[PDB]
Amino acid sequence: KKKLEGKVAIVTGGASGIGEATARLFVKYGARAVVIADIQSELGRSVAESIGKERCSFVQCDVADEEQVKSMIEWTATTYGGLDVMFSNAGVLNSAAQTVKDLDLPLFDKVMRVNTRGAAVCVKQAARKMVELGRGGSIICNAGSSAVRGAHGVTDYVMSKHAVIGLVRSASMQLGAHSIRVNSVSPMAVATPLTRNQGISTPDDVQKFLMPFISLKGVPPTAEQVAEAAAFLGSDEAAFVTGHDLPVDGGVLCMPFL
Amino acid sequence: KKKLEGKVAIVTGGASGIGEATARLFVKYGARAVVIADIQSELGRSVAESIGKERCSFVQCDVADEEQVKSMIEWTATTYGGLDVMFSNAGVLNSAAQTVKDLDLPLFDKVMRVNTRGAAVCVKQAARKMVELGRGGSIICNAGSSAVRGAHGVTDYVMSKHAVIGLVRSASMQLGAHSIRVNSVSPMAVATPLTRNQGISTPDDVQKFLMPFISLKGVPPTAEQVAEAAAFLGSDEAAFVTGHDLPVDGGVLCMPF
Amino acid sequence: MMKKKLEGKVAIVTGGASGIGEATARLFVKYGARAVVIADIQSELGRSVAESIGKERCSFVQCDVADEEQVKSMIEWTATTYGGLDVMFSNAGVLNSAAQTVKDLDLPLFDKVMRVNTRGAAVCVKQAARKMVELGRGGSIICNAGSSAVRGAHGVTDYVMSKHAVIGLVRSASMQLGAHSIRVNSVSPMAVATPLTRNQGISTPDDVQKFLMPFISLKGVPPTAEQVAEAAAFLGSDEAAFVTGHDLPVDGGVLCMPFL
Amino acid sequence: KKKLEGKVAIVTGGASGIGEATARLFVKYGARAVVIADIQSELGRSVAESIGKERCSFVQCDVADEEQVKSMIEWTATTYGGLDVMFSNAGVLNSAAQTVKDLDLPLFDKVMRVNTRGAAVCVKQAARKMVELGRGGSIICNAGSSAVRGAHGVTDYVMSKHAVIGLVRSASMQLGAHSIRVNSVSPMAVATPLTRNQGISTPDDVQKFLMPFISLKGVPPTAEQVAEAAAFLGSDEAAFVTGHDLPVDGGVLCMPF
C-alpha cells in the first residue's frame, strides 16, 4: 500500500524545484490527484502534462491573494472529492544581499508578501476546507534552515521563515481539535531558480558555497529528499506528528558567510 | 556609576506602557537623553515633559516609515551628539481573535507592518548611525513570550514576534563586526493599552487569565521589570551578550487558551 | 505488502523486548530489514519477542546498554552474523516510580536513570559509530529521547536531565560522524502506555486519555507504539537520507508537560 | 542601592576563574557575604582572603557529595543568616578529545558527576534551604554555549551542559510556587584553568581559536562579563526572570572545529 494512496494534494509553487519534485513524488506514492498552484502558467501546465493530466491539474494562483487561493482550493475539492494534504511551498528570494544595515525595504515587502502572507492565506484556506470536510488533514509549509537561525544576509528571507515557524506552531495548536496536523519542512542545499538569486545554480555551487557549513558528507543534496520528507508528513506514517519543523539540510552548522 | 550614565537612547513606542517605563528607568539610570519616538504625539509630549525636558524629547514617528525613522535618528544623533541604545519597542495587537481559520488578512497586514517592518526599519537605521559613529552600540527589540511558542489565537502577532527573533539573530551576526549588540526582551504579563485589545486591562485580569500559565508566583508582574531587562541589555553589564532573547515572563508553561 | 523502505538493512534495537522497541523491531522486519538484533536485559521476554518476529530475521542478545564491553560484544556479533550494521536504535530507558522533584530528589535514583539513559546512549552511539566507520557504508543512529528532552517537567527531574543529555549527544554525534555519511537523530515519544510509563501511573490507553491528552494538541488520533516505530523507520531509511542532527517528536504537539 | 545589597550568596567552584570573578563582583555589588564552596582548599582560602574575610569565607565542598553540600549550606545559613543566591558554577572539562567514536567512558563519568550530579545536588539543597526560609531566592547554574548546540568533541561535556538546561527548566517550574527563580548563564570564551584543558590559556589563544566562531568583535571576553550576568540574575533586576539560559558568549555561530 503506497503511503499517499487515494489522497488529494495541493502543492503551491509546484511548477519548479522542490514543489515540482514533490508533486511528482506524491503521484508516485499513489495520490488520487495533485493540484499545482503557481503563477508560472506555461511552466505549471507543462509540469502537469508531464505528470499526467488524469492525476495532476494546474491552477493559476498567486498564494498571497486570498480569493485566488480560496477559488483554487474549492476547485480542487469539487474536482477531486477532497483535500487531504496542502503543501504551502511557494517562496521568493531577492538577488540583493539584504543585509540589515543596507536592507531594501521594498524588496523586504516582496519577500514578506509571498513567504508570510502566502503561508498564512494557504494555511487558513486549507484549514477551512479541511474543517468543512471532517476528515482531518495534513498541512505542510516549506520553511528553510534560516527559519531557526540567523544569517549574514537575506535578512528579509530569514524573518519570513521564522514567521512561518510561528504560523506552524500556532496552527498546530488551533487545528489539532479537528485532527488536522500542521508541520514544516526546511531545506537548505537544493539548487533551483530561487537559489540562483543568491548564486547557487549548479550542484558544484552547492558543494563550494554551502557544503562547508553542512555536517553530512557523501550524500549529494536533492529536491527529491525534501519531497520525501513532505510525503512522510503528508501521510499516515506521521499520524501523530504536529507542530514540528523537519529539516532536510544535512545538519547545518551555521548559515554561510557573505 | 549608574549603568546608563551619559548614554543617548531612543525608545520607540515610548508614550505608554513598557516603553514609557523604560524611558523613565533609563533616565533614572543616568541616560543623558532619551528620545521617545511614537505615533501618540499628544501623549508622548506629555510623557517627555513629565520625565523632564532636559533629559527627554518626543519625536513623532511611525516606525514602519523609513524616512520618518531616518529623520528621527538623524535628529537624535545631531541634537545629542551620539546614539548608544535603540529600544525598538513599538507594537500593535488587534482586538479580533485572529485564529488562523478565521484570520482577518488586512489586520494581519497591520500587525506585520508595525511589528516586523517597524523592527527591520529601526534596526537598519540605528545600525547605520551606530556604524557611522564608531562607538559600538546596543539595539534591543521588544518581542514577547509568543516569539518562541505558538498560541491559540493572535496568529498574526505570533508570526510577527517570531520574525523579530530572526531579525535579532541575523542583525547580531552582521553587526558584531562593528561591536554592535542586538538582542530582544520578551514580556508577557504587563497590563497596557495594547493588552487591553485581548481583554487584559488590569493586574487582576493578569492574575485570572495569564498567571495560571506562569510558573513564578508571589512576584506581581510590572512594566518596570521589563525596563530592568532592557537597561541591563542596553548597558555594559551586557557587554558580551548578543543575539539573545531575554524573557521577562515568569516562566511561561504555554500560551493561554 | 508495505513499501520495503528498510530492505536489506541490519538493525539493532536496544530495549527491544518491550514497548516501543518491540514495536520498532517488528516494523523494521515488516519493512524488509535483513535482520533485527534485540539487545535487552530481559532475557526470557527478549527471546520470546525474537521468536515471535521470526528467528531467521531476529535474534536476541543479552546486553546491558550501560556496560561498554557487553555492547561492543553484541555489535561485533551482529556485524559478524548478519554482515553489517546499518541502523542502531538506542531505545533502552528507565523511569523511576518516585516523583523525583528537585526539592526532594533521590540522588541514588537519579544515578540509576542517568546510567541507563545517558551512559547507555553514549555507549551505544560510540560503539555503533565505530562499527559503521569500520564498514564504510554510512549508517543511521537513532536515540529514543522524549517530549521532556526539550522542555522542563514538574517532576521526573532526573529523567528530564537524561533526555536533554541525549539531545546533546545526538547533535554532537551528527556533527562528528557526518564526514563518514553516518546520520544521527532522535525520536521523541510522549503518550504510549508501556511498562516504563506505568512507573508514573500511565498503564492503559484510558490513563493516556485522562492524564496526558489534556496537554496534547492533536485530537482524534489515539497514540500508539507503532507511530513511534514509523518515525524510527523513516529516520533509519533512505527516505531521510539528508536528515541528521534532528529530534523528531511523535507526541501530538505537547503544550507543556503534565502537572503532578 | 547596589543590586545585591545585604544578600548571602554561595558560589560553587569559586576558587578560580568565573566563580572567583563572580564572588568578587557580588561583594562589590553589596552582598553581605559570599561563601566559596570548592575542593581546592588552599586556593579557595587565598581567594576569600583577597576578597576580604569580613565578606567572604571558604568552605571545603565536593558539589557531587550531597552530605558535603548540605553541610556547607547549613554552615552558610548559620554563619550569615540566610541564603539568597546559589551560583552552582563548579565544572570540569577533560583534556582528552572526547569524540563520540573514541569516547573514554570513565572520563565521561567524571564530567557527568561534577557537571550534572553536582548541579542536581546544589539546586536541590539550595532549594530546600530557600523553601525553609520563606524569602524566595535565585538559583543560577553555569551551563555554557555547548548547552544548546552540538560540538565536534568534548561530547561528555556537551551532554552534561544540555542536562543542566533540563534541570534549570524543571526546577524553575517546580520552585516558582515559592518565589524561587532558577536560571543559567552560558559562557564560551573566558580563558581559565578549565579551558587550558582544551588548549585555551591566553588572550591570543582566545582570539585565534575561539573568536572566529563568535559574532561580536572589539570586545575582549572576560570572566567579569559572566559575573555581571550572574549578578543581574541573582538580583531583583531579574525579579520576574526564570527558566532561562542567559548566554554571555558574543553570539556563537557554531562550536569550534
Ligand SMILES: NC(=O)c1ccc[n+]([C@@H]2O[C@H](COP(=O)([O-])OP(=O)(O)OC[C@H]3O[C@@H](n4cnc5c(N)ncnc54)[C@H](O)[C@@H]3O)[C@@H](O)[C@H]2O)c1
Ligand atoms: N532550494 C533550497 O535549497 C531551499 C532552501 C530553503 C528554503 N527553500 C524554500 O523552498 C520553497 C520552494 O522553492 P524552490 O527552491 O523549489 O524554488 P523554485 O524557484 O524552483 O520554485 C519556487 C516556485 O514558487 C512559485 N511562486 C513564487 N511566488 C509565487 C506566488 N505569489 N504564488 C504562487 N507561486 C509562487 C514560483 O513561480 C516557483 O514555481 C520556497 O518556499 C523556498 O523559500 C528552498
Ligand SMILES: NC(=O)c1ccc[n+]([C@@H]2O[C@H](COP(=O)([O-])OP(=O)(O)OC[C@H]3O[C@@H](n4cnc5c(N)ncnc54)[C@H](O)[C@@H]3O)[C@@H](O)[C@H]2O)c1
Ligand atoms: N504588555 C505585555 O505584557 C507585552 C507582552 C508581550 C509583548 N509586548 C510588547 O511590548 C511592546 C510595547 O507594548 P505595550 O504592552 O507597552 O503597549 P502600549 O500600548 O502601552 O505601548 C505601545 C506603544 O507603541 C506605539 N505604536 C504603535 N504603533 C506604532 C508605530 N507605527 N510607530 C510608533 N509607535 C507605535 C503606541 O502608540 C504605544 O504608545 C510591544 O511591542 C508589544 O508587542 C508586551
Ligand SMILES: NC(=O)c1ccc[n+]([C@@H]2O[C@H](COP(=O)([O-])OP(=O)(O)OC[C@H]3O[C@@H](n4cnc5c(N)ncnc54)[C@H](O)[C@@H]3O)[C@@H](O)[C@H]2O)c1
Ligand atoms: N512510552 C512513552 O510514551 C515514552 C515517552 C517518552 C520517552 N520514552 C522512551 O522510550 C524508550 C522505550 O521505552 P518504552 O516506553 O517502550 O518502555 P518499555 O518498558 O516497554 O521498554 C523499555 C525497555 O528497555 C529495557 N532496558 C532497561 N534498562 C536497560 C539496560 N540497562 N540495557 C538494556 N535494556 C534495558 C527494558 O528491559 C525494556 O525492555 C525509553 O528510552 C523511554 O525513556 C517513551
Ligand SMILES: NC(=O)c1ccc[n+]([C@@H]2O[C@H](COP(=O)([O-])OP(=O)(O)OC[C@H]3O[C@@H](n4cnc5c(N)ncnc54)[C@H](O)[C@@H]3O)[C@@H](O)[C@H]2O)c1
Ligand atoms: N571558561 C569558559 O569559557 C566556560 C565556557 C563554558 C562553560 N563554562 C563553565 O563555567 C564554569 C566555571 O568554569 P571556569 O572556566 O571558571 O573553570 P575553573 O577551572 O577556573 O573553575 C572551576 C572551579 O570548579 C571547582 N570544582 C571542580 N570540581 C569540583 C567539585 N567536585 N566540587 C567543587 N568544586 C569543584 C574547581 O576546583 C575550580 O575552582 C564551569 O561549570 C564550566 O563548565 C566555562
Ligand SMILES: [Cl-]
Ligand atoms: Cl535557508
Ligand SMILES: [Cl-]
Ligand atoms: Cl506574548
Ligand SMILES: [Cl-]
Ligand atoms: Cl517524555
Ligand SMILES: [Cl-]
Ligand atoms: Cl561551552
